[PDB]
Design an enzyme around this catalytic site. Structure first.
Site, mmCIF file in Angstrom:
data_model
loop_
_atom_site.group_PDB
_atom_site.id
_atom_site.type_symbol
_atom_site.label_atom_id
_atom_site.label_comp_id
_atom_site.label_asym_id
_atom_site.label_seq_id
_atom_site.Cartn_x
_atom_site.Cartn_y
_atom_site.Cartn_z
ATOM 1 N N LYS B 53 49.988 66.316 41.120
ATOM 2 C CA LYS B 53 48.641 66.500 41.650
ATOM 3 C C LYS B 53 48.346 65.382 42.640
ATOM 4 C CE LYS B 53 47.311 68.923 37.482
ATOM 5 N NZ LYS B 53 46.529 69.080 36.242
ATOM 6 N N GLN B 97 43.406 65.600 32.361
ATOM 7 C CA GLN B 97 44.669 66.252 32.091
ATOM 8 C C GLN B 97 44.754 66.617 30.608
ATOM 9 O OE1 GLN B 97 47.035 67.124 34.408
ATOM 10 N NE2 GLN B 97 48.114 68.129 32.733
ATOM 11 N N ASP B 120 38.185 71.924 37.580
ATOM 12 C CA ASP B 120 38.964 72.820 36.736
ATOM 13 C C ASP B 120 38.144 74.038 36.276
ATOM 14 O OD1 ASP B 120 41.769 72.412 36.115
ATOM 15 O OD2 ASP B 120 41.240 70.552 35.102
HETATM 16 N N1 LIG Z 1 43.058 69.766 33.284
HETATM 17 C C1 LIG Z 1 44.037 70.700 33.187
HETATM 18 N N2 LIG Z 1 44.014 71.750 34.057
HETATM 19 C C2 LIG Z 1 44.955 72.722 34.031
HETATM 20 N N3 LIG Z 1 45.193 73.844 34.745
HETATM 21 C C3 LIG Z 1 46.318 74.418 34.236
HETATM 22 N N4 LIG Z 1 46.828 73.686 33.203
HETATM 23 C C4 LIG Z 1 46.028 72.614 33.027
HETATM 24 C C5 LIG Z 1 45.996 71.441 32.104
HETATM 25 O O1 LIG Z 1 46.882 71.292 31.221
HETATM 26 N N5 LIG Z 1 44.998 70.550 32.246
#
Ligand SMILES: Nc1nc2[nH]cnc2c(=O)[nH]1
Ligand SMILES: CN(Cc1cnc2nc(N)nc(N)c2n1)c1ccc(C(=O)N[C@@H](CCC(=O)O)C(=O)O)cc1
Ligand SMILES: CN(Cc1cnc2nc(N)nc(N)c2n1)c1ccc(C(=O)N[C@@H](CCC(=O)O)C(=O)O)cc1
Ligand SMILES: [Cl-]
Ligand SMILES: [Cl-]
Ligand SMILES: [Cl-]
Ligand SMILES: [K+]
Lengths: 284, 284
Positions: B53, B97, B120
């Site tokens: 990321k 995360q 998210d």
């Molecule tokens: N924060 C977060 N976003 C996601 N989007 C897809 N998988 C994940 C994850 O494990 N954590």
């Protein structure tokens, strides 16, 4: 082939007795459960429904406050009333009777109700809590009433193939989410579905909330199906029926809700229960 | 018949170039898009994901702030960090995360992120907005990326019979909701589904997010199916595969995502897009 009626009328009566006792307790603690209902304009059905809701409140010990606003009320004026009710500690639930006038944006009004008084469960955060699988926040009355009706008849939902026809925010979407939370496999069908029968013919459970007379027919179901009819449709003759062809589908059903007297009474019962839930939250 | 690979890697790269250009213009007007990523502990997969990321942010002009916290930090310490970030006007997106340590309540942590930086799309109000079919929130990155990949190929979703395998909050539930919003008929299957193949054999579109190698086999699909594979499973050999038996299912598919190089890159691209969207909102 022994069919059993899902008698929401009788269950709703039992729930009202339960609430009457809860309210006697709450009142002894100085809490008078109170639902505010906002009715905008002069829609004849709406008048009747609100009167029914008020009467149901009085029967089970809930204080009702009905606000009769002008059909020409501006959106900000409606918001101002909701703001007042949001801050009124004596009010535990706030319901805005739908439909609102064409010149009012429903979604904005509903999001303005404080989520802790949102007894319809329409506020985006309450929708979110339910979709996250959290079922302690307010849940919408119609699908919650269906879940309670099914539970009363000791119907096990885990692993069941369920079909919901209609994808509304008021019923279809939260109904699907509650069933999925309960471990059912869920299909959500609607007017754009290519072949409803593909889904319904395999279903253990069908919830019909599509607004169309005789939408669900006997050749669309398998024997033993459980059928829940959320429809309320007035025929030209004035007869009320659901969305299901009851006469024929009931012959193939293990359990089925009649219309009237099925889902309808349960929706009101859950409005009452959600109001008492908010009031109980005030206990120390 | 012709099969087409849904090339998420190429699409993601183009999106990144598009965001790099947008960020040049934003930066010239005093806004530097910025994502804060919070990583608790040293889960090796998690560290890899976070580095990915951060690298992607750098490629498209997003400033990243990576907070790598000890696994033994308290829930309160995490909340305090998120509170600070919520109020830091230079930070546009906050991501935690997952997974968190057992002693930290995930639901509480996610709801504590201010909804306007919730890139998210996990905050209950953002989940609610999506479920209401509204466009006023942030959408979760994995299903959003799937929708963007489908749209990049002009795949018409109205009326399609879609099956979503997996009912998680991160992928399956919002995926089903986005497809329903787009006019598809949706079925959500999971570990309690009695006969998965009953659903998949009839599907026009299958989204697989089950985390099981070879879950979807060629005898489970019909000719012309569209298959989206959200799985990322590492074999004994080391080779990465999805949840689909790609060699065989691809022979029957009109469109299919490869793994790697399908959904994975799009999920990251949507994180970047959601971050820039938040930054752009902050313009005077
Ligand atoms: N924060 C977060 N976003 C996601 N989007 C897809 N998988 C994940 C994850 O494990 N954590
Ligand atoms: C089950 N049921 C009865 C029901 C339940 N809770 C309520 N709650 C409130 N506050 N008001 C109502 N009229 C109401 N009605 C339903 C079911 C679907 C729709 C519905 O989708 N109608 C509108 C949407 C909302 C509206 O009435 O404006 C439409 O799109 O046609 C309405 C009521
Ligand atoms: C099945 N359904 C949704 C729905 C969807 N599409 C439709 N489409 C048409 N053409 N007609 C409908 N009645 C219709 N209804 C319902 C079911 C019950 C009620 C109902 O009884 N509503 C009363 C209020 C009931 C209440 O207050 O709880 C109302 O005035 O909105 C409305 C819609
Ligand atoms: Cl419909
Ligand atoms: Cl009724
Ligand atoms: Cl990948
Ligand atoms: K091709």
């Amino acid at each position: 082939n022994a069919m059993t009626l899902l008698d929401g009328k009788a269950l709703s009566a039992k729930i009202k007795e339960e609430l009457k006792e809860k309210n006697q307790f709450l009142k002894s603690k100085g809490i008078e459960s109170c639902l505010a209902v906002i009715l905008v304009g002069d829609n004849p059905a709406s008048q009747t429904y609100v009167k029914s809701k008020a009467k149901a409140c009085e029967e089970c010990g809930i204080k009702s406050l009905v606000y009769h606003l002008n059909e020409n009320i501006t959106q900000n004026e409606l918001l101002a009333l909701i703001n007042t009710l949001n801050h009124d500690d004596s009010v535990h639930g706030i319901l805005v009777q739908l439909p609102l006038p064409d010149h009012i944006c429903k979604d904005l009004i509903l999001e303005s109700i404080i989520s802790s008084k949102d007894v319809d469960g329409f506020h985006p955060i309450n929708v979110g809590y339910l979709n996250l699988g959290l079922e302690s926040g307010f849940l919408p009355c119609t699908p919650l009433g269906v879940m309670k009706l099914l539970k009363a008849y000791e119907i096990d939902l885990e692993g069941k193939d369920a079909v919901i026809i209609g994808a509304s925010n008021i019923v279809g979407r939260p109904m699907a989410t509650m069933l999925l939370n309960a471990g059912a496999t869920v299909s959500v069908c609607h007017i754009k579905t290519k072949d409803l029968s593909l889904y319904t013919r395999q279903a253990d459970l069908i919830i019909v909330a599509a607004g169309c007379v005789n939408l669900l027919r006997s050749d669309m179901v398998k024997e033993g199906v459980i059928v829940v009819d959320v429809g309320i449709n007035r025929l030209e003759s004035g007869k009320i029926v659901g969305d299901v062809d009851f006469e024929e589908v009931s012959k193939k059903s293990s359990y089925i809700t009649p219309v009237p007297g099925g889902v309808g009474p349960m929706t009101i019962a859950m409005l009452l229960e959600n109001t008492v839930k908010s009031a109980k939250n005030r206990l120390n």
